[PDB]
Amino acid sequence: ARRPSVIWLSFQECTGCTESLTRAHAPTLEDLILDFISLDYHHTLQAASGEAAEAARLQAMDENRGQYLVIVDGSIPGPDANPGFSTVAGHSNYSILMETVEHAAAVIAVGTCAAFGGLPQARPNPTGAMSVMDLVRDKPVINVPGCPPIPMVITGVIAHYLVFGRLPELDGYGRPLAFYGQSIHDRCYRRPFYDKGLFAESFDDEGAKQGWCLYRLGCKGPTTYNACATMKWNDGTSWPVEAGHPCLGCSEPQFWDAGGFYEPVSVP
């Protein structure tokens, strides 16, 4: 102990959230790992496999009791679902979650699956998937949703916690205000076009080419909270609506089940 310990649990994930983390330009994952944290367990990157890998997670939990951070990627089949739907080293994800968070300082649920249930939880939920906050109640939990979240939102939250020595201020769903405090639609560069009644009617008509609003093609920006419209993606390169596709709503609970992606809602 001396760099704070971080344990990364990967459950029913697609590994998008870890890839996103490796995209972040500041602080980079390598600077974090060498200089700022001690990333003590992470399946994607671990030299050791099998019991040597499991022993590293357990020794981290032993030596940093009360102090380590847990980051969880993916939904977890709940304790009423078959323990065999998702296991590591012969234990269920649910068992590993509860045992690893028991002595954490805090838990970050990264990605909409961990935060809210996400894809494995979309109808009809064949594996009884659940979110971290539903399963873990006696711990501070920070939700950092998105599918995946923006890379510099992930490291932004981590840098906040490490540099300023506290949890970010959260909205009612446990999401950091700095990144999730404003809707896409209240920041979107097509918004004044929306308000003038200028809309694209396909992906490459005059309105699409000119950056008219994507509302008629299904955009869920009006009810979606994320930093894409201001911070943008991949070191400020672009974001989904700037590249010509409607926002899918991918940082909102149950966004997979909001009717079709290409259908407008019934009002605002």
Partner: protein, 559 residues
């Protein structure tokens, strides 16, 4: 009883290997995927235009490839032809995904099997610079740079918080590189992380974000208008050009020469780790607008029994040809658990308990019935291998000039015969060689995009069948793709505007999938059964080298 490695790390997703040992020799191996989501079941009833966004989230390491297979499946079902610019843009995004994904597989997932990080701390920084410089023109090679890299790793290791290096297999006799080569590879590992996050900007330009860019059925969502503030224009196209150049440089100067220099110390790995002899490609990457297999950069076909003189034809729709079996998988088929289903008739009914799944906490699988969440795909009853080795063999067999030159000059440098391709080494080498082929092709598709736009065609989306009311009330189609891990297909059946069935068969499904009703092993299992010995069952680096050479992805394999 069996030796167990669970988790396999440095892959994507959740993989357990069990091995029945005979002395130091692997006698039987078993490959088990230990997480399922049932995305196929999630899709039923939904809009086919939305499918791509769901199945892209099968996997964020091979991000893009299920989006592409999905919109192609819909386009196949509905017979939508793409505009040329859409097809070029898709090729460019596919090439960018291969290059990103292979380079990170090699450094960040595979290389710690071959590279001893503790040994790098002993290297002389000057000798490390001489070696780097004797193999490559890559600029970043100064002795002070190697000494500064070594010092950062030395401070880390000496802090006593070894992080992802803790309990590693450092000093195992399977590690053979000199300290200098280890330090060089570690420096390149770190350069590859900076390079990859820059490369990812390419998908963000066309697709809005990476991971998980956007797609649409019928074209690409990003329009082209040179006179617009909100479309692809000369400014955005100039950024794309620079990204292709940094891709080319990193492949030519860092990834390929490192793969070749490291291979020279592991030539005996050219004699193990390929136990099937059969390879399958659907092919991909057309020169023009139409998805016509005659124009593919990667050809469609199958090789049987290591015979490169006959390419067997592949039919994606023949119900006796591609089938998935569940004789040793945790699934129930209404036709009987011994039957194979073609994916138009696929079924995904999860059944752990009744198929012999063992209740956690457990120490051993029961391998007499279901032992995996992977289905077992077979091609006309055969176990096959897909992925870079299958592609490079197909290219070689069909007379692709550049592939032939690269394969010949590689084997010649290593002094190895053609049959060393059929191995853990050859697979790892194939991955690097096909990266070189793809990175050279990128310039041709980019130039063809610019020329097409310059001549006045700025179309990017065929709207004609966008509305469900324009579709037949029954349609079915297959979307094929050569994903970085191998042949990928999505079979869709559409009824009355809705998904009636959707079945994915994914490259790591083929390779990692378990035994079938004849006891015929899958690629990983037959690979471990081919000429492997473990020095130490607690540090099974020999298993990892071969398993990692397939670049496993279990979120893809199981979905």
């Amino acid at each position: 009883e069996r030796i167990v490695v669970d988790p396999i790390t440095r892959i994507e997703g959740h993989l357990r290997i069990e091995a029945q040992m005979d002395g130091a020799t692997i006698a039987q191996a078993y490959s088990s995927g230990t997480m399922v989501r049932g995305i196929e079941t999630i899709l039923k009833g939904r809009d086919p235009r939305d499918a791509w966004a769901f199945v892209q989230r099968i996997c964020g390491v091979c991000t893009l490839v299920h989006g592409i297979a999905s919109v192609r499946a819909v386009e196949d079902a509905l017979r939508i032809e793409l505009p040329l610019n859409a097809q070029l843009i898709r090729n460019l995004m596919i090439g960018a995904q291969y290059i990103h994904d292979h380079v990170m597989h090699f450094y960040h997932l595979h290389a710690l099997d071959w590279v001893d990080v503790v040994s790098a701390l002993s290297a002389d920084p000057r000798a490390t610079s001489e070696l780097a410089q004797s193999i490559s023109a890559w600029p970043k090679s100064s002795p002070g740079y190697f000494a500064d890299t070594q010092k950062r790793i030395k401070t880390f290791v000496e802090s006593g918080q070894l992080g992802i290096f803790a309990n590693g297999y450092w000093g195992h006799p399977a590690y053979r590189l000199p300290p200098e080569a280890n330090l060089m590879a570690v420096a390149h590992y770190l350069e590859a992380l900076a390079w990859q996050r820059d490369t990812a900007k390419f998908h963000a330009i066309f697709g809005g974000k990476n991971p998980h860019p956007n797609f649409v059925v019928g074209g690409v969502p990003s329009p082209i208008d040179l006179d617009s503030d909100s479309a692809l224009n000369a400014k955005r196209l100039a950024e794309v050009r620079n990204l292709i150049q940094s891709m080319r440089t990193f492949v030519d100067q860092v990834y390929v020469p490192d793969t070749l220099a490291i291979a020279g110390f592991y030539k005996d790995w050219g004699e193990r780790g390929e136990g099937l002899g059969n390879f399958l490609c659907y092919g991909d990457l057309p020169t023009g607008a139409s998805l016509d297999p005659a124009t593919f950069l990667f050809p469609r076909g199958a090789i049987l029994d290591r015979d490169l003189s006959t390419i067997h034809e592949v039919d994606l729709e023949a119900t006796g040809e591609i089938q998935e079996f569940v004789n040793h998988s945790w699934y129930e088929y209404s036709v009987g658990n011994d039957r194979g289903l073609h994916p138009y008739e696929g079924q995904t009914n999860l059944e752990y308990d009744r198929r012999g799944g063992v209740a956690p906490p457990y120490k051993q699988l029961d391998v007499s019935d279901g032992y995996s969440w992977l289905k077992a795909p077979r091609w006309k009853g055969r176990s096959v291998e897909v992925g870079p080795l299958a592609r490079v063999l197909m290219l070689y067999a069909t007379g692709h000039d550049q592939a032939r030159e690269l394969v010949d000059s590689t084997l010649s440098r290593l002094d190895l015969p053609v049959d060393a391709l059929y191995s853990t080494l050859g697979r790892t080498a194939a991955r690097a060689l096909e990266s070189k082929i793809l990175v050279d092709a990128m310039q041709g598709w980019y130039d063809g995009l610019i020329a097409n736009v310059k001549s006045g065609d700025t179309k990017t989306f065929n709207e004609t069948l966008w509305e469900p009311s324009s579709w037949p009330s029954r349609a079915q189609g297959v979307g094929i793709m050569e994903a970085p891990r191998g042949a990928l297909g999505h079979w869709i059946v559409i009824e009355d505007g809705r998904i009636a069935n959707y079945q994915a068969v994914v490259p790591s499904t083929w390779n990692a999938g378990p035994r079938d009703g004849r006891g015929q092993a899958g690629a990983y299992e037959a690979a471990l059964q081919d000429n492997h010995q473990l020095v130490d069952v607690k540090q099974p680096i020999e298993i990892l080298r071969t398993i990692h050479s397939f670049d496993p992805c279990i979120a893809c394999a199981v979905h």
